Amino acid sequence: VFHKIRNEDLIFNESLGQGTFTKIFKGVRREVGDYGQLHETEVLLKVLDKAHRNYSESFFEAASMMSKLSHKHLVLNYGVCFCGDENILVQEFVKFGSLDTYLKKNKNCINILWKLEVAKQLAWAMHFLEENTLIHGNVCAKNILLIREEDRKTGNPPFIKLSDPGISITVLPKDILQERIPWVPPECIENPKNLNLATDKWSFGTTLWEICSGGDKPLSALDSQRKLQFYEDRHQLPAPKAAELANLINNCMDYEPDHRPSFRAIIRDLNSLF
Ligand SMILES: Nc1nc(Nc2ccc(S(N)(=O)=O)cc2)nn1C(=O)c1c(F)cccc1F
């Protein structure tokens, strides 16, 4: 159960747009921290409309279930504000933000080893979720958050965390799931009850394509109807700009869910590319 945070201890400072039936803000939390030290902590606030009851329930159950699993590559949730007409997730603010935006702002001037390190970290996170039989369901480059940039002097790689799952595809409207092709796998377009650990293996492939494509979105030129037909016709994505991961992407984006490799196997594959 999430720690409750009082509306009175939250300041909203900056609008950061919208997620899927969410409004996102940067703000500050006034808290009592380690040793009774008063802190003013930068926070990321995700606001759900209480009137969208099934969406909110799904969102906060997903966030809660994953926050029960502390992990270096999973975002820290501080708690929730049940304040009136809205329920608010209070989350750590990750300094360098979403990986797709990061790659655009840096004009894809990162080398293949940087991409491999981020891919490995994501794979380790997903391996941990797989061992805990916890489906994420919204793996994508925008939900990869950069804590730290690479430091060439120390050899430190970039360091990432994976965002909270959001509203489950089992409750979202079909048109939203179709918009989310090709992150949502074909079996889930067919029936959202086909959600399975296999789902995240497919989406991991799509996310690798993003990482290797400088933050481009695959199939952006296709509308919801032509994306649904892209699966009906069983097409695969084009090889990304950095072709080094093309084989791994194809192996993960397997139309047969049971053939998608384990994240343990995926990690070994990534290691062998170096
Ligand atoms: N927890 C979290 N921290 C951030 N850091 C952030 C956000 C925006 C910027 S900006 N306006 O480009 O300069 C810079 C740093 N994002 N974040 C999220 O969960 C998050 C997400 F996963 C997807 C989309 C939006 C988010 F907000």
DSSP secondary structure letters along 94-124: -TT-BHHHHHHHTTT---HHHHHHHHHHHHH
Task: Tell me, in angstroms, the distance from the centre of ligand 1 to residue 205's CA.
Answer: 22
Q: Indicate whether 18 and 138 sit together in one domain.
A: no
What angle is formed at CA 253 by the lines to CA 213 and CA 112, rounded to 5 degrees?
A: 35
Q: After which residues, if any, is the chain broken (C to N > 2.5 Å)?
A: none
Is 2 domain-assigned? no
What are the residues facing 86 on neighbouring strands?
A: 49, 83
Ligand 1 surroundings by CB, under 6 angstroms? 16, 24, 44, 75, 91-94, 97-98, 101, 142-143, 145, 163
Size (the chain), residues: 274
In terms of Cα–Cα distance, which of 142, 199, 202 is closest to 169? 199
CATH number of 30's domain: 3.30.200.20
CA distance 14 to 27: 7
The first and second tokens of residue 204, run together, are 């991991």
Tell me how far apart the alpha carbons of residues 73 and 52 are, in angstroms, rounded to a whole number: 30
Mutate to test the pocket of ligand 1, among 21, 77, 94, 139 (most ligand atoms within 8 A of CB): 94
Ligand 1 centroid vs 76 CA: distance in angstroms? 13
Which conformational region is residue 211 in: left (phi greater than 0), alpha (psi within -120 to 50 degrees), or beta? alpha
- How many of the other CB atoms lie within 10 Å of CB of 256? 9
1 within some domain: no
- Number of domains within the chain: 2
Q: Which atom of ligand 1 is nearest to the CA of 14?
A: 11
Q: How far is the CA of 8 from the centre of ligand 1 (A)?
A: 23
Ramachandran angles phi, psi of 148, nearest 5°: -150, 135
User: In ligand 1, which atom is closest to the CA atom of 143?
Assistant: 22
Ligand 1 closest atom vs CA 16: 11
Distance (Å, whole) CA 178 – CA 120: 28
CA of 44 to the centre of ligand 1 (A): 7
Q: Indicate if 152 and 224 belong to the same structural domain.
A: yes
Are 216 and 108 within 8 A, CB to CB? no
On whether both 11 and 60 belong to a single domain, the answer is yes
State how far the alpha carbon of 3 is from the alpha carbons of 31, 81, 204, in Å. Answer: 12, 9, 31
Q: Which two tokens stand for residue 19?
A: 């997620």
Name, in order, each residue with C-beta under 8 angstroms of 93's C-beta and a sequence gap of 6 or more.
26, 42, 43, 44
- Evaluated on CA atoms 228, 52, 138, 202, the torsion sign reads negative
For ligand 1, atom 1: residue with the closest CA: 93
Q: Are residues 193 and 86 in the same domain?
A: no
The answer to whether position 21 is within a domain reads: yes
**Secondary structure (3-state) at 171:** coil
Residue 188: both structure tokens together? 């889930």
Spatial CA neighbour of 244 closest among 206, 273, 214, 201 = 273
Phi, psi (degrees; rounded to nearest 5) at 32: -105, 115
Residues 6 or more apart whose Cβ sits within 8 Å of residue 45: 10, 12, 24, 25, 26, 27, 88, 89, 90, 91
The residue whose C-alpha atom lies closest to atom 19 belonging to ligand 1 is 163
Reading the block at residue 70, the tokens are 């502390």
Q: Are strands 144-148 and 77-83 parallel, antiparallel or unpaired?
A: unpaired
CATH number where 143 lies: 1.10.510.10
- Report angle CA 178, 184, 190 to the nearest 5 degrees: 70
How far apart are alpha carbons 248 and 217 in whole angstroms?
18
- Structural domain for 54, as ranges: 7-92
Beta strands in the chain (DSSP E): 10-19, 22-32, 38-49, 77-83, 86-92, 144-148, 159-162
Give yes or no for a contact between 65 and 59, defined as CB atoms under 8 angstroms apart: no
The protein residue whose alpha carbon is closest to atom 11 in ligand 1 is 16
Last-in-domain residue among 42, 59, 92: 92
Mapped onto helix, strand or coil, the DSSP state of residue 2 is: coil
Going from the Cα of 256 to the center of ligand 1, the distance in angstroms, rounded, reads: 33
- Cα separation, 256 vs 261, in Å, equals 11
Experimental technique behind these coordinates: X-ray
Residue 51: beta bridge partners? Answer: none
Contact indicator for 234, 162 with CB cutoff of 8 Å: no
**Whether residue 259 sits in one domain with residue 147:** yes
Helix axes 263-272, 197-211, angle to 10 degrees: 30
**Most ligand 1 atoms within 8 A of CB, residue of 12, 13, 14, 16 to mutate:** 16
Phi-psi category of residue 242: left, alpha or beta, with phi > 0 → left and psi -120 to 50 → alpha = beta
Q: Are 205 and 143 in contact (CB under 8 A)?
A: no
CA 10 – CA 146 distance, rounded (Å): 24
Question: How many A from CA of 226 to the centre of ligand 1?
Answer: 30
Residue 164: name the closest of 131, 137, 195 by CA. Answer: 137
Question: Rounded CA gap, 79 and 67, in Å?
Answer: 10
Residues 181 and 263 grouped into a single domain: yes
Question: Crossing angle for the helix pair 197-211 and 112-131, nearest 10 degrees?
Answer: 170
